Amino acid sequence: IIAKISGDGVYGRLKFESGGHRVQRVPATESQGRIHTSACTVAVMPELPDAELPDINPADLRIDT
Amino acid sequence: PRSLKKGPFIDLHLLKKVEKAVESGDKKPLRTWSRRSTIFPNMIGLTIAVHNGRQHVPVFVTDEMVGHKLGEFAPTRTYRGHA
Amino acid sequence: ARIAGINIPDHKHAVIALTSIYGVGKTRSKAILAAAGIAEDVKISELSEGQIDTLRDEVAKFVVEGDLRREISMSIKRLMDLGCYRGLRHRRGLPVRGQRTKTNARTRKGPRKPIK
Amino acid sequence: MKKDIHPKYEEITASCSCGNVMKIRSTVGHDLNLDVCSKCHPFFTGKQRDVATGGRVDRFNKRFNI
Amino acid sequence: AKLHDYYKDEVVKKLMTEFNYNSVMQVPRVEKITLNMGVGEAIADKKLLDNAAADLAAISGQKPLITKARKSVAGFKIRQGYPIGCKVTLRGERMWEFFERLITIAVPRIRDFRGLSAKSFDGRGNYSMGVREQIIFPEIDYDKVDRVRGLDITITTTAKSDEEGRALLAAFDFPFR
RNA sequence: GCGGGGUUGAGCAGCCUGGUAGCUCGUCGGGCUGAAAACCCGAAGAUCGUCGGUUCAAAUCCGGCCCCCGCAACCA
RNA sequence: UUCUUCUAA
RNA sequence: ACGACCAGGGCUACACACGUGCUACAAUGGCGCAUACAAAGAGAAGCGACCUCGCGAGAGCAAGCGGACCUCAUAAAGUGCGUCGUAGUCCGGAUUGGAGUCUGCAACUCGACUCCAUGAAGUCGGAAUCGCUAGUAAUCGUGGAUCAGAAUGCCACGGUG
RNA sequence: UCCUCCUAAAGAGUAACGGAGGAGCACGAAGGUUGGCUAAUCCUGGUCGGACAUCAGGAGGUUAGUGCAAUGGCAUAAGCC
Ligand SMILES: [Mg+2]
Ligand SMILES: [Mg+2]
Ligand SMILES: [Mg+2]
Ligand SMILES: [Mg+2]
Ligand SMILES: [Mg+2]
Ligand SMILES: [Mg+2]
Ligand SMILES: [Mg+2]
Ligand SMILES: [Mg+2]
Ligand SMILES: [Zn+2]
Numbered sequence: 001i002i003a004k005i006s007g008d009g010v011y012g013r014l015k016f017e018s019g020g021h022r023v024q025r026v027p028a029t030e031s032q033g034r035i036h037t038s039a040c041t042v043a044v045m046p047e048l049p050d051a052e053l054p055d056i057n058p059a060d061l062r063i064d065t
Numbered sequence: 066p067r068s069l070k071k072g073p074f075i076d077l078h079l080l081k082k083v084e085k086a087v088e089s090g091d092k093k094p095l096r097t098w099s100r101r102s103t104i105f106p107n108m109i110g111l112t113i114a115v116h117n118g119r120q121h122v123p124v125f126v127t128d129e130m131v132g133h134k135l136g137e138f139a140p141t142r143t144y145r146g147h148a
Numbered sequence: 149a150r151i152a153g154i155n156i157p158d159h160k161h162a163v164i165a166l167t168s169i170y171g172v173g174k175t176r177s178k179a180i181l182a183a184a185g186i187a188e189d190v191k192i193s194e195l196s197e198g199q200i201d202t203l204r205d206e207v208a209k210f211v212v213e214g215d216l217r218r219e220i221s222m223s224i225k226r227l228m229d230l231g232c233y234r235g236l237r238h239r240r241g242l243p244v245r246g247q248r249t250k251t252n253a254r255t256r257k258g259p260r261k262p263i264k
Numbered sequence: 265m266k267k268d269i270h271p272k273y274e275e276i277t278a279s280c281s282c283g284n285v286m287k288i289r290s291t292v293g294h295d296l297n298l299d300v301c302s303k304c305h306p307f308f309t310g311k312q313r314d315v316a317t318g319g320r321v322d323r324f325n326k327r328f329n330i
Numbered sequence: 331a332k333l334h335d336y337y338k339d340e341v342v343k344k345l346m347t348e349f350n351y352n353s354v355m356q357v358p359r360v361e362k363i364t365l366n367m368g369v370g371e372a373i374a375d376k377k378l379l380d381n382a383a384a385d386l387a388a389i390s391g392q393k394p395l396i397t398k399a400r401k402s403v404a405g406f407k408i409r410q411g412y413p414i415g416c417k418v419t420l421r422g423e424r425m426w427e428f429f430e431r432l433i434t435i436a437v438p439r440i441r442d443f444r445g446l447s448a449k450s451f452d453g454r455g456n457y458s459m460g461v462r463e464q465i466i467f468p469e470i471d472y473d474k475v476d477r478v479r480g481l482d483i484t485i486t487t488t489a490k491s492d493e494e495g496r497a498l499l500a501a502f503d504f505p506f507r
Numbered sequence: 508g509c510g511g512g513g514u515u516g517a518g519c520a521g522c523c524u525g526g527u528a529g530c531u532c533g534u535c536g537g538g539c540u541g542a543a544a545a546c547c548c549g550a551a552g553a554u555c556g557u558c559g560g561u562u563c564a565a566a567u568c569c570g571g572c573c574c575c576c577g578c579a580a581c582c583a
Numbered sequence: 584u585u586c587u588u589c590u591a592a
Numbered sequence: 593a594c595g596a597c598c599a600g601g602g603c604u605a606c607a608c609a610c611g612u613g614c615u616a617c618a619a620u621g622g623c624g625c626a627u628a629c630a631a632a633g634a635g636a637a638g639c640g641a642c643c644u645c646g647c648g649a650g651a652g653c654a655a656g657c658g659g660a661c662c663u664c665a666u667a668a669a670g671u672g673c674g675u676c677g678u679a680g681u682c683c684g685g686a687u688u689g690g691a692g693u694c695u696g697c698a699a700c701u702c703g704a705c706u707c708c709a710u711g712a713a714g715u716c717g718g719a720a721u722c723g724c725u726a727g728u729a730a731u732c733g734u735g736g737a738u739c740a741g742a743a744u745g746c747c748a749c750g751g752u753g
Numbered sequence: 754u755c756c757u758c759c760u761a762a763a764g765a766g767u768a769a770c771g772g773a774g775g776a777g778c779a780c781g782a783a784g785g786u787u788g789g790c791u792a793a794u795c796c797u798g799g800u801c802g803g804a805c806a807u808c809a810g811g812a813g814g815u816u817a818g819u820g821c822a823a824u825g826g827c828a829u830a831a832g833c834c
Contacts, residue, residue, distance in 0.1 A: 362809090364808055364809060365808090366799090366800090366807065366808040366809085367800085367807085368800090368801095368802080368806065368807030368808075369801095369807080370801095370802080370806050370807070371801090397806095397807055397808080398807085399806060399807080400806085400807085401793095401806090402806095403805055403806060405803095405804090405805060405806090406802095406803095406805070406806045407806095408806060412806090414806060414807055415806080415807040415808085416807090417807080417808060419808095447798095449798085450797095450798050450799065451797090451798070452797055452798040452799080452809065452810050452811090453796085453797040453798070453810070453811070454797080454798095454810055454811060455810085456798080456809060456810055457798085457799095458798050458799040458808080458809070458810090459798095459799070459800095460798095460799050460800045461800065462800055462801080463800080464800090478800095478801080479800085479801095480800035480801060481800065482799050482800055482808070483799085483808095484798085484799070484808055484809045484810090485809090486808095486809060486810075
């Protein structure tokens, strides 16, 4: 699951939530009642802007006819 | 509702402050934990705060509030909406 | 065949046909015919007019169709404007008398709006 | 007015519940006995009563005495 | 001509006094009464209008001219010229005889009666009103009719101002307030 | 440069010479199950790429228009 | 006649 | 202080979903009058007759009773007669307004009940699914426990069957 | 191929692979005559009625209408019954 979080100070609060997150619990998919140790993972990556619609300039070119 | 033969109910420590706030002559908010007290005609016009489990919300008392108790103007469940 | 603003039908028995007025039920229509002297199981057809012309005054003793709706809508707007708990019940659409709102409030809430 | 298209217009008697005897030119035909009219309506009597504002402090000093 | 007899003797001298007219011809007089049932739900067939036009002819004794659509609107699903409503202009005699039966019988028999308005004189003296149910007339038996018709009475007079048409209907004791 | 199309969450009919929004997949909620599939039941969902205009009225008719599927850009 | 699966203490 | 004390609140919230129930969707039924038959319980700070007041919930006086005596207690379904005659109805009772009573320092949140007015959905319910083998299922009443008050729950009890 | 304006230079005509649009009909009444008739849009009021049906009132002065394109016309109406 990938969510965009629009808000103020989003990455300032959640940048320390990366990496693994481990449960030790009795699962809901366990019939024997034994306790399993599972893990998840969270990526918190800051929303950079767009790359940029490329603006070419005919001074950084060399045209061969 | 209460029986007619008992009359309306009000708390003494409020009734000791209704009598005080009449004779004092002020528009001061008096904060009150008695939600269960019937409003009297000498209480009209007083901004008073009824407790609602968390805070004290000031209530202006009008003419048409006499038969009603104080707690009807201080909501306790701060519900907003599911969506 | 027409009392106090509405048209009472002509085939029913006496108190039963009277209850079509917004303001009388089975008990008050027994009290309307208690002062009009009419038996409560005669039809509205084959009556006498002087019975009926006094019968309209008995209904006019009380509060009825246009007036009873005007007082009730005034007493609702009395609660709507006080900002009391019951007025907040009426204008959210929730049940007033203190019922279960976790389940079975279908009369004040109507048909179900599914979660989208 | 043409002789065929316009319906029947027979002057009748308009009786009432309060004793109003009036003679209208009408298209009913049969005898007319009314219910309310301009004579005895609760407009000049009871429109002031049927508002029913009601007193709140005035209701309060009924239900006890001190 | 009962109210027209009643107009020509008391009401004529009355409006000379309470407006101070120069001449006798300056008095506001009523010209016609229009009875309209614009029934836009008669697009299915003529029959719902054919049963309604016969109802309004029983209200006051004229066969009503079926009015048609002036232009076309597809927002109301009518082309130009659909039979859409019926009107009756009562002039001369039959105006007053309806104007007596309306002000005495059919108007006080209206349910939740709280009088008429004084704000409905269309800017220039011609008072208009509208009734909800056709069964306020004693022409209309409740068992015999089946659809709740309703019409709107339009009174057209020769009043220039707004108060002069008010004082004209106040001479006939018209139920305002 | 000439043709075909842009339609609920998705994919397509219906486009008809203009008055009337369909299906499938999916989604939601039940049922069966110990549970999950598959199945079964009951639901809903559209401003017809877009913008002007023509008629009473436009997904439609038209005109420009945005994306693309193509087709063709040749003889020396 | 048809009918699949049950991961890791 | 994750210990202790008091006030007010919450455990009663509400787009939704599920389970267990109650009352209905009526005529083998409703309503009105009359009339017939239970069982098993409970009762002292109590059950409370009788009588009066009140439309009623109740109130007042106040016996009798620590109970095979007295009291809650009237059983209801049924029966007999009468009307309603297939309708959103004299079905249904939600909801809502006013008015009360009772309990309790105290009924706003948040009590039950009564009166008057009001009269939603519902005309027997899809996929499916549950109980039951004889005094049973079905159906109608009664009481107790809990409790100042406050059951459509539970635990009991009999009638028809 | 036909139709209308512009190009077209105040008679007529006038070109281009110049700018723009339409037609391959319709109608037994949409024709003839006689007799009447005056629109569009906005405003104020009025039962369901709502920006918009239908009814009055006034402003308004062809902004409408013309079986269809555009142009020229049309109230003595060629418009509407
Ligand atoms: Mg459409
Ligand atoms: Mg599955
Ligand atoms: Mg030239
Ligand atoms: Mg020239
Ligand atoms: Mg022509
Ligand atoms: Mg001519
Ligand atoms: Mg209007
Ligand atoms: Mg011609
Ligand atoms: Zn009368």
